[PDB]
Amino acid sequence: MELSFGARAELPRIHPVASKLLRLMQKKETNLCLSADVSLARELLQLADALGPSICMLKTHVDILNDFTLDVMKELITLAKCHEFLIFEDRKFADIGNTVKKQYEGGIFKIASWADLVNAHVVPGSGVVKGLQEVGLPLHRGCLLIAEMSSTGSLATGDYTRAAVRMAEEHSEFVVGFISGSRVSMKPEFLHLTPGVQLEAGGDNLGQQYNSPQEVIGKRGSDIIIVGRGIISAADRLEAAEMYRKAAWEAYLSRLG
Amino acid sequence: MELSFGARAELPRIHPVASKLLRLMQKKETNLCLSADVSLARELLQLADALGPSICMLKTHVDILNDFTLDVMKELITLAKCHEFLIFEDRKFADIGNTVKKQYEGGIFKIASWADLVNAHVVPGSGVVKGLQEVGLPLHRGCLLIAEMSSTGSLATGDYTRAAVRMAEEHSEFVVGFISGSRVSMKPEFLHLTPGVQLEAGGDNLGQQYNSPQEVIGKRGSDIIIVGRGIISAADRLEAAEMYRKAAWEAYLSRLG
Ligand SMILES: O=c1cc(O)n([C@@H]2O[C@H](COP(=O)(O)O)[C@@H](O)[C@H]2O)c(=O)[nH]1
Ligand SMILES: O=c1cc(O)n([C@@H]2O[C@H](COP(=O)(O)O)[C@@H](O)[C@H]2O)c(=O)[nH]1
Numbered sequence A, B: 001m002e003l004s005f006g007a008r009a010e011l012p013r014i015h016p017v018a019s020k021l022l023r024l025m026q027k028k029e030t031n032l033c034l035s036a037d038v039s040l041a042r043e044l045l046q047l048a049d050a051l052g053p054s055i056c057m058l059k060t061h062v063d064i065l066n067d068f069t070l071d072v073m074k075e076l077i078t079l080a081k082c083h084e085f086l087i088f089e090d091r092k093f094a095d096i097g098n099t100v101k102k103q104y105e106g107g108i109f110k111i112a113s114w115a116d117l118v119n120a121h122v123v124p125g126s127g128v129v130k131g132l133q134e135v136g137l138p139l140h141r142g143c144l145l146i147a148e149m150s151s152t153g154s155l156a157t158g159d160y161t162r163a164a165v166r167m168a169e170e171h172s173e174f175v176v177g178f179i180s181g182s183r184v185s186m187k188p189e190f191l192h193l194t195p196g197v198q199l200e201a202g203g204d205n206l207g208q209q210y211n212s213p214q215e216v217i218g219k220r221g222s223d224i225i226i227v228g229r230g231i232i233s234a235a236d237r238l239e240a241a242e243m244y245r246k247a248a249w250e251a252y253l254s255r256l257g
């Protein structure tokens, strides 16, 4: 009884940020999240503009942007609105609730002011979510919980993964899904986003491991692929993004049947 | 066969950053780390100057400083050198190795340029440490691994804690100890730093739980207490720091016997 992205966007318990995302995924035929892991604002913005039509989401690491300003993020929002994609700051909040609330709202990045989505590790216990939601619920934001990781030696397995799913399902007013390698929740209101994706087999020299779009979307049941170097290190990033988009989209279609 | 801090500073396998810390702890009779969880640079610097003689370490969250600049960190270094304490940026790196290397060296904070110590969660596997050490070893820095957390529902227990200890003991050229609630390693070359500390019982409304200096240093065998609100929310932060310093130091002495 698997529903399309467009039908999932209408589910009774859907979060509004998840619904917006699912609707634009269906409209644009994309379940690709670009991992824009660059250090220059101009490159970030040029990628966002050119690849915007091909992506459902742009994932940032603003803390690696050498020339971050809030006005860069204003320009990114313009592109996100134009091309219709969400902005996901991959901050991996991972502290006690009292600390993460300040890290999300404040400092020089003011993440909550521009990021539709953020994510959190579950290791601190549910206070990490409660602290973020003090800021994010008034701002109509969503959060993803890290239930599994792609890297060698990941401890996000077994009972840890189960705890992440329970934490999400108990904070569904704010948590909209997971970073995971596979479908971890049986509730269709939750999004599954999977990093560690390339077309070719392999990894990196610092513990990254890759699986293909067909494997992660088609076999493992995830919704969205997160792709960094498979796109950004290519010469033609637009054609690379299109290859990843077509791969992930067809894997999704074939699995709906 | 418990050694004093000053003797631990001479151990054959000691890391140079740990040795520097242990020597100044012994010299100054302090095993207190101030958690300087403030949003203004002037308050950060005024606390560092006034409390510097009372502390072995100042723990920052630079991502909550509304008016961060690199020149603020230059002024903090001056105070750290004057008063003899280490600077610990509590960034909780928690990503794949390729990402954390960039988050540690780069962006607007350039953490590795000013922080003696950083810390990491072990959930990604050991690539998190390998990525950080690509930057931190050339810069003669150290790292702490988060083996336990103070907050309600923490998943850093059992086999997760054991994995953190193994990861530290296999990366001892860079990892100098732990964030933990107790002694987790039997190797005296590793430092144990414990947050979730107040003189009075209680917690916060976002999952923080407190234990006393006597409990954590004296019974649970930790080395250093990390104290935020128990000091910073007090009217007289200097006298508060002195009360925490005296508590932690006496608990350490009584346990050496
Ligand atoms: O398990 C995880 C979780 C992540 O967010 N990531 C992130 O996804 C991206 C992967 O990038 P790449 O495709 O270049 O390996 C990085 O930004 C990384 O921080 C990951 O690789 N694995
Ligand atoms: O297990 C942990 C790990 C931490 O670093 N911390 C940090 O230690 C400090 C605790 O502050 P406080 O004493 O105000 O509760 C915070 O900066 C928090 O981020 C913690 O409380 N528990």
Ligand code: PRO
Binding pocket: A199, A200, A201, A212
């Ligand atoms: O792992 C494999 O064999 C295939 C080849 C390309 C990606 N997956």
Ligand code: PRO
Binding pocket: B199, B200, B201, B212
């Ligand atoms: O928990 C208790 O009872 C004591 C009282 C102060 C701190 N510890």
